[PDB]
Amino acid sequence: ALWQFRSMIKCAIPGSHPLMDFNNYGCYCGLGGSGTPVDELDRCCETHDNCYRDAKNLDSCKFLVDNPYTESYSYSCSNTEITCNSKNNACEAFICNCDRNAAICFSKAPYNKEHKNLDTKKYC
Ligand SMILES: C[C@H](CCC(=O)NCC(=O)O)[C@H]1CC[C@H]2[C@@H]3[C@H](O)C[C@@H]4C[C@H](O)CC[C@]4(C)[C@H]3C[C@H](O)[C@]12C
Ligand SMILES: [Ca+2]
Ligand SMILES: [Ca+2]
């Protein structure tokens, strides 16, 4: 679930700032998106979006209001390392892994302040 994704990000990036959640970044970090990602960090968010799109396409998976962000799973954090519980059901596991890979992706991507709250209607 979205709140768990935020938790994973803190796990992989302890120094991240909470207030950032009020902000969007690039063309894809935030809800929806358009055009092409502006940088590596933004690419991570687009890939995460694509990962969720794939999950929704699994006929075996149905999410509340068709939103994977509502799907709660089980995961654990240990020394900045994220582990998705093997007990998650197939749909939950897919979502957990999308979240995990995105969190890892975020942890390695450079952060460009100029891309925070970007004028998407113009650059996306
Ligand atoms: C982890 C990175 C980096 C933060 C940072 O300030 N780094 C400085 C540094 O490099 O040291 C941030 C930048 C924009 C954030 C996203 C936006 O706030 C939009 C949206 C907000 C949601 O609450 C959680 C998911 C996410 C996709 C957020 C995931 C994550 O929270 C992002 C992708
Ligand atoms: Ca997005
Ligand atoms: Ca669940």
Q: How was this structure determined?
A: X-ray
Atom of ligand 1 nearest to the CA of 41: 33
Yes or no: say if 75 and 59 are a contact pair by the CB < 8 Å rule: no
> Domains of the chain: which residue ranges?
1-124
* CB-CB contact of 88 with 108 (8 Å): no
Question: Active site includes 99?
Answer: yes
Q: What's the CA gap between 95 and 1, in Å, rounded?
A: 8
The 3 state secondary structure assigned to 61-81 is: CCCHHHCHHHCCCCEEEECCE
Element (H, E) at 82: strand 81-84
- At how many Å resolution was this determined? 1.9
| Domain 1-124: top CATH class | mainly alpha
CA torsion 22-88-106-39 (nearest 10°) is: -90
Catalytic-role residue among 48, 54, 115, 119: 48
Q: Is 115 a catalytic residue?
A: no
The span from the CA of 54 to the CA of 56, in Å, is: 5
Mutation test residue for ligand 1: of 4, 24, 29, 104, the one with most atoms within 8 Å of CB? 29
For residue 71, the CA-to-ligand 3 centroid distance in Å is 5
The token duo for 36 is 């092409």
84 alpha carbon, distance to own chain's centre: 14
